[PDB]
Amino acid sequence: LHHAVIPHGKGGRSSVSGIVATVFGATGFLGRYVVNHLGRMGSQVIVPHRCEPYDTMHLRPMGDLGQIIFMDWNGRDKDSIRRAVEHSSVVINLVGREWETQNFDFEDVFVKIPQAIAQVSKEAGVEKFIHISHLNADIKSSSKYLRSKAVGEKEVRETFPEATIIKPAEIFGREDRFLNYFANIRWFGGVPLISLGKKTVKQPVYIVDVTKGIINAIKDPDARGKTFAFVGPSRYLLFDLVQYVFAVAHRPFLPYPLPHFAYRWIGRLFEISPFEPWTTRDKVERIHTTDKILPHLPGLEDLGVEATPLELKAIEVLRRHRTDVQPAKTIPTS
């Protein structure tokens, strides 16, 4: 524990792995899985949080005594970010939001805050920096969510050149907003879709695969200053994918088309609430965006992670929606 930190032990709860990580946005969906893997191997995890301490309780059991440390931070306060990274050797940014708030829009969560963390991390002396982006990130799309990601990805790549950008597709899991999203369209009617789910190809990836990929990027030396594209093993049509979700959840599937402009309006209706919107204009766009194919970026297979097929671990997610299923037709590689 002089030059960096020497690993010690068997790689269990009470071991020392040498990883001192600050995980921004650790209180969300992808955050709880990243902290669980870091703390499960004996890492010192620092968890800045904006929420009530009551909402960080599901993280305390994830590490031995003293291994999970909680700090208050403000996305717009550079000093708070400095206090949370000055002692770390790796910084992971999972800050994000599926909707805009009166105080935080997509240009804050995905551009300004990530660049603030990257800058303070660079001058604090942090050596490794992992930033999460989107697979479909580019400034050409109707989704302001995806336009912000492309801008933020470029700014992170400039403030912290040795950063490691991860570009995952729609992540599915127990607490995801992807498979659970195609299961809450039952109290209104059928399943609205742009077109009828055709001309929309999705490549979802398992949450543990993304988590295991981020862990291996910390340990792997030849991942500094590199971009990855974490994608699932199989590609699906949004119609076939959603049909599979309802079959696994044993719900009656009544797909009917809806105009693209018509879906926007009902998105407006559901985003007037003060709480987590059920759906929004940007959410509809992203679901109906086609997952890019970037074969020039190393993916999960370049970090020793075997992508988990959606059919194998979809029952564990949709079990709670229920009151021998044919696998969905998949696009061949060709």
Binding site: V20, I46, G66, I69, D72, S89
Partner: protein, 96 residues
């Protein structure tokens, strides 16, 4: 006798202080490092040396049964004081 390291952390009476690059300092961020202010090595030096008129004096720490085991201290050596092994009090022999 609490000294402060260049980074600003207090040095404990055992000499403990985290180096500049040690990550374990992160446990004190938003909290404090508990350091006892009364250094024993400094307070027992303030006690005066006791002048006795015999070659062997006995110390029991003061208080009888509330002190420490009674030990006898030899004061024949004139180049130093006879220190009690339990409590640190010092004794000297009057003009011999």
């Amino acid at each position: 006798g609490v000294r402060t390291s260049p980074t600003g952390e207090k040095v404990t009476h055992t000499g403990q202080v985290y180096d500049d690059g040690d990550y374990r300092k992160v446990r004190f961020v938003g909290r404090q490092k508990e350091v006892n202010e009364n250094f024993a090595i400094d307070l027992i030096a303030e006690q005066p040396v006791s002048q006795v008129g015999s070659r062997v004096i006995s110390c029991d720490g003061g208080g009888g049964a509330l002190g420490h085991p009674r030990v006898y201290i030899n004061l024949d050596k004139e180049t130093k004081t006879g220190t009690c092994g339990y409590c640190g009090l010092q004794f000297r022999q009057q003009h011999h």
